[PDB]
Amino acid sequence: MNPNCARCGKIVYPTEKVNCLDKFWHKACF
């Protein structure tokens, strides 16, 4: 039940918890 990127679709590992509004993305997916 891992957080998938709100843009690409892949799991956002705890390494790459991008801070948008309220959820998780990756670096280039911000």
| Range 1-30, binding Zn ion (CB under 5 A) | 5, 8, 26, 29
Name the token pair of 21. 């509004």
Judged by CB under 5 A, how many residues of this single chain contact Zn ion? 4
Closest separation between CB of residue 10 and Zn ion, Å? 5
Closest separation between CB of residue 2 and Zn ion, Å? 12
For Zn ion, the closer of residues 8 and 20 by Cβ is 8
Burial 8-23 (b: 16+ CB within 10 A, else e): eeeebeeeeebeeeee
